[PDB]
Amino acid sequence: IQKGNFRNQRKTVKCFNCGKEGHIAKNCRAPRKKGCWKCGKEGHQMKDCTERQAN
């Protein structure tokens, strides 16, 4: 099982902020960006990132 493109549950767990294994952004010690770790856009935290995509 996995939720992302990467092995974030499948054997390993992978951080969304810094991209390294063995932890999650809640447990991470790296500096936090001016935007979302889940889509990359500014002005929100990734739990407010609930809206649908479009084209």
Exactly one of 47, 50, 53, 55 binds ligand 1HF (CB under 6 A); that residue is 47
Size of the site for Zn ion (CB under 5 A): 9
Interacting residues with ligand 1HF between 5 and 24 (CB under 6 A): 8-9, 13-16, 24
Q: How far is the C-alpha of 18 from the C-alpha of 21, rounded, in Å? A: 9
Q: How far is the C-alpha of 27 from the C-alpha of 30, rounded, in Å? A: 10
Q: How far is the C-alpha of 46 from the C-alpha of 16, rounded, in Å? A: 10
Interface residue list for ligand 1HF (CB under 6 A)? 3, 8-9, 13-16, 24-26, 32-33, 36-37, 45-47
